[PDB]
Amino acid sequence: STIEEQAKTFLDKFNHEAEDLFYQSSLASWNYNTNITEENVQNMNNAGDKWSAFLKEQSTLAQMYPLQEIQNLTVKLQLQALQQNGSSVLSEDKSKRLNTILNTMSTIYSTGKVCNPDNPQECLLLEPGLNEIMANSLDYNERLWAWESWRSEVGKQLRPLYEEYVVLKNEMARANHYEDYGDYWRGDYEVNGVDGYDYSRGQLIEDVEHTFEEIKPLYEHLHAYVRAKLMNAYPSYISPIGCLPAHLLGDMWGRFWTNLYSLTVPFGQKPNIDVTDAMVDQAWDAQRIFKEAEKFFVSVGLPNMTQGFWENSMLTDPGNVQKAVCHPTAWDLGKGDFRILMCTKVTMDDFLTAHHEMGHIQYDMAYAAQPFLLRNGANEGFHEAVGEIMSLSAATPKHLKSIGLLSPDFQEDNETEINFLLKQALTIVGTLPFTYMLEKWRWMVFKGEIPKDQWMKKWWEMKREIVGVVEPVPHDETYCDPASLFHVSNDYSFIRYYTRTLYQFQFQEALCQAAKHEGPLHKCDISNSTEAGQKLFNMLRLGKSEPWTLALENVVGAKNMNVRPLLNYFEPLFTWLKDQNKNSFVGWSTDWSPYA
Amino acid sequence: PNITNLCPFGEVFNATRFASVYAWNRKRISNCVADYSVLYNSASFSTFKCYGVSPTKLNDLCFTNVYADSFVIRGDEVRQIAPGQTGKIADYNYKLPDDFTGCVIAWNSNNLDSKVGGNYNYLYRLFRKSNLKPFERDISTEIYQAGSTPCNGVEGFNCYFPLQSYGFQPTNGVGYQPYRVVVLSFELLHAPATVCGPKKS
Numbered sequence A: 001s002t003i004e005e006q007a008k009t010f011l012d013k014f015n016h017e018a019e020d021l022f023y024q025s026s027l028a029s030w031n032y033n034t035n036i037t038e039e040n041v042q043n044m045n046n047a048g049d050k051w052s053a054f055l056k057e058q059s060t061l062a063q064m065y066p067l068q069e070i071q072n073l074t075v076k077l078q079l080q081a082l083q084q085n086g087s088s089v090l091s092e093d094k095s096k097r098l099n100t101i102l103n104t105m106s107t108i109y110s111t112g113k114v115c116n117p118d119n120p121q122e123c124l125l126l127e128p129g130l131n132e133i134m135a136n137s138l139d140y141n142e143r144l145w146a147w148e149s150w151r152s153e154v155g156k157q158l159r160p161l162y163e164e165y166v167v168l169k170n171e172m173a174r175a176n177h178y179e180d181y182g183d184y185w186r187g188d189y190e191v192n193g194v195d196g197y198d199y200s201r202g203q204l205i206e207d208v209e210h211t212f213e214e215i216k217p218l219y220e221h222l223h224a225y226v227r228a229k230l231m232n233a234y235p236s237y238i239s240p241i242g243c244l245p246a247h248l249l250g251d252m253w254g255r256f257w258t259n260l261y262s263l264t265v266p267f268g269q270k271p272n273i274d275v276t277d278a279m280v281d282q283a284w285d286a287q288r289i290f291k292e293a294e295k296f297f298v299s300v301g302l303p304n305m306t307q308g309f310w311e312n313s314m315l316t317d318p319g320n321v322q323k324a325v326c327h328p329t330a331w332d333l334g335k336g337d338f339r340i341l342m343c344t345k346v347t348m349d350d351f352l353t354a355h356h357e358m359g360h361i362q363y364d365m366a367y368a369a370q371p372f373l374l375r376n377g378a379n380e381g382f383h384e385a386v387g388e389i390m391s392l393s394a395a396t397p398k399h400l401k402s403i404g405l406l407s408p409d410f411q412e413d414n415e416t417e418i419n420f421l422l423k424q425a426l427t428i429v430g431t432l433p434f435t436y437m438l439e440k441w442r443w444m445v446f447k448g449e450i451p452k453d454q455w456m457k458k459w460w461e462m463k464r465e466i467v468g469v470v471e472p473v474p475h476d477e478t479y480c481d482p483a484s485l486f487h488v489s490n491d492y493s494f495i496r497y498y499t500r501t502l503y504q505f506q507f508q509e510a511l512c513q514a515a516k517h518e519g520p521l522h523k524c525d526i527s528n529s530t531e532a533g534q535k536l537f538n539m540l541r542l543g544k545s546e547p548w549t550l551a552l553e554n555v556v557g558a559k560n561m562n563v564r565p566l567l568n569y570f571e572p573l574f575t576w577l578k579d580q581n582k583n584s585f586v587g588w589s590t591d592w593s594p595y596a
Numbered sequence B: 001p002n003i004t005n006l007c008p009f010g011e012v013f014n015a016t017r018f019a020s021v022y023a024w025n026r027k028r029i030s031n032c033v034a035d036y037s038v039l040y041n042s043a044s045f046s047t048f049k050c051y052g053v054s055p056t057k058l059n060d061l062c063f064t065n066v067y068a069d070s071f072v073i074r075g076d077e078v079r080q081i082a083p084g085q086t087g088k089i090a091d092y093n094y095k096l097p098d099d100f101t102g103c104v105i106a107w108n109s110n111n112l113d114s115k116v117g118g119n120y121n122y123l124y125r126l127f128r129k130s131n132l133k134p135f136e137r138d139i140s141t142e143i144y145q146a147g148s149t150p151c152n153g154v155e156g157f158n159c160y161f162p163l164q165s166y167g168f169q170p171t172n173g174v175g176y177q178p179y180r181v182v183v184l185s186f187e188l189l190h191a192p193a194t195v196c197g198p199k200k201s
């Protein structure tokens, strides 16, 4: 009869057909990931092509129902999600060129192998050949060689490809009534039609700058401390007044600073909270790791894992004969099928990762009651944030003592809390200026603020201004230094990590207030608290049905992303860093004072 | 006295194939001895919810006829086989009256009704213009008209085929796994009641 009822029946038909087709595609992707064989690649490609063709045909059918004649918010949300053209609005030649460019960037990044000139008989791939060198070496020129050689080969291959990529993506986005591709990425946080809870694409950049201006003193003090420690590690290269050299940050790109914890530890004499040896002594299998994670999630009141989870997941490396992707991934395959693909070792990192991925699984299970096209996070930040809060809670010494993994006579003094908070800052605080600078650079590239002949002059200028990291030697425009990273070379949004980091501590304060924890925020554990799990599950059950602002109101009581919980989390470390930086100089100079 | 000629519950519960919920099988059971304690004390049933009567006195009471309706639905759709419920199965496939006397028995059949490729032999009606009356069967395969345009018998735009297949894989969740449902309807009519329980010696 009416247009709204027509759209509702069409959405019912789409949900029923799409759920089975998505399950077939997801099962094929799982069979490729747990078994890397060429016929599984072909089966994955066939299922993915069927799924994409079905989405094209259903979007073509979906557009015939106009949006402004529908008043129900959930129906309008599903129709908005379905009616996006994607690349279909672009011409077939340019669509084929864009798909070819994306695939060849994926192959160049995945199969990029670089080794030293005059010694070419064997070479090292990025994972794990270059990762281990970047994370463990203490030699200046070796890390400089690895960094410059990988940005030489990868950037000089990817620079014309990225120049084609920006033009094609901007053409597709302006064909989709967006200002640029950056506006298309910022449209994930766009809320329209809800009274009071509306969020704009232009508000995202303003909110990110407003939060980063409050991030900046903590990052300046952390940067000064890391600069002083790296000056101790490398005596002559680092200047007291200048930026950090780029190849010394412990990772390939500077994404995380967590591999500098050995060099920058405050109190090495005091012990660590490493529980690896304790699990090895008690012979903890990966099955026991996931069962302890499940015990954590049933203690907070969330549902326990399905029988199909324990039957169908791969929680251990299969062997030499069977090939699998080593990256930990939680899979919502559809039709109530939830699996975790992780090559789990007996380490603290794998145990925390098990908590993180089972948090992903809990988030996926919670919105299973929602319609198919609303089965997502409210934004891209929440989905990762709900795993990172489990990683926060499980890492606490109270949780380790409670499950028996830590000795009950372990002394929790202020020094261990300082060095634990510094490790968490190197992981968490250090990624924030890099993430913000990378997304702001990509937004200015898509917006046309930066011309193609000035990409790198601006980029290093941004990195010196924001991240406080200087290039070792100057790079011309033949280099493509951003696209050496996984997310930018493979067409992924990057602001999800910034929003995830802020949502993580906002959710942590909300659940710790729910759990009535009376101490520091980093000492807080959300186990045994039914009300914290209920406050979590109220947002978890919504999925994408409600705006992310309303979901954030449901958890923390605020309509916008906030920076104060993060600053409250690191406040003991902030006071300690302000005490330790009396002699040294906080802040950096954008000049070439260390090295250029 | 000594009792023989039990009611054919083996041809209802242990059937090799079950009907689809849109075309649910109804078997009228008359003139035999119905032993209900065999069903109630079985550990193989997940749902044995009886409405209007208790299972303990079923083996005593006597009824004129017993209607055994058999079909297959999903795990999440078992709750809709109840008086007063709302959903696709209750509105469009199988409707129970509010004044219903009988029992709803459901059990998981992922072992039988799921194959690795996907078992698409079970259909359900997705669209109908109006809700079903209680104990009504709709086996029509005429194109549903959701829009003003005439369908003309072809599935185009706003015109959908009302029967949709169930996807049954063995790796699905318990809310998507196939459940075989047998609904027993007990009525007493003015004719002499012949479906009686077993009498103790």
Ligand SMILES: *[C@@H]1O[C@H](CO)[C@@H](O)[C@H](O)[C@H]1NC(C)=O
Residues within 6 Å of the ligand: A035, A037, A322
């Ligand atoms: C992985 O693929 C090989 C090659 O077909 C196959 O023999 C093997 O059974 C697969 N592994 C599993 C666990 O199915």
Ligand SMILES: *[C@@H]1O[C@H](CO)[C@@H](O)[C@H](O)[C@H]1NC(C)=O
Residues within 6 Å of the ligand: A008, A072, A073, A074, A075
């Ligand atoms: C929107 O539609 C859903 C079903 O599609 C319904 O449950 C919900 O109540 C509707 N909301 C409003 C405000 O009409």
Ligand SMILES: *[C@@H]1O[C@H](CO)[C@@H](O)[C@H](O)[C@H]1NC(C)=O
Residues within 6 Å of the ligand: A063, A083, A084, A085, A089, A176, A177
């Ligand atoms: C998708 O592309 C078609 C063809 O240009 C256009 O008519 C339609 O408005 C587009 N949809 C959206 C949501 O922009």
Ligand SMILES: *[C@@H]1O[C@H](CO)[C@@H](O)[C@H](O)[C@H]1NC(C)=O
Residues within 6 Å of the ligand: A304, A305, A306, A307
């Ligand atoms: C999950 O919890 C339910 C209820 O507490 C329990 O019956 C079930 O056995 C649990 N699942 C597993 C795999 O133990």
Ligand SMILES: *[C@@H]1O[C@H](CO)[C@@H](O)[C@H](O)[C@H]1NC(C)=O
Residues within 6 Å of the ligand: A414, A415, A418, A576
């Ligand atoms: C820990 O507390 C003691 C006692 O107040 C103090 O002397 C010491 O400086 C503190 N350590 C740190 C790292 O703040």
Ligand SMILES: *[C@@H]1O[C@H](CO)[C@@H](O)[C@H](O)[C@H]1NC(C)=O
Residues within 6 Å of the ligand: A299, A402, A527, A528
């Ligand atoms: C949470 O509950 C379990 C079960 O009673 C208990 O063993 C554990 O010690 C509790 N955690 C804390 C921190 O008390």
Ligand SMILES: *[C@@H]1O[C@H](CO)[C@@H](O)[C@H](O)[C@H]1NC(C)=O
Residues within 6 Å of the ligand: B009, B010, B013, B014, B044
């Ligand atoms: C049906 O099959 C089950 C499972 O083997 C069996 O226990 C039962 O006796 C059979 N017959 C009836 C009437 O339930």
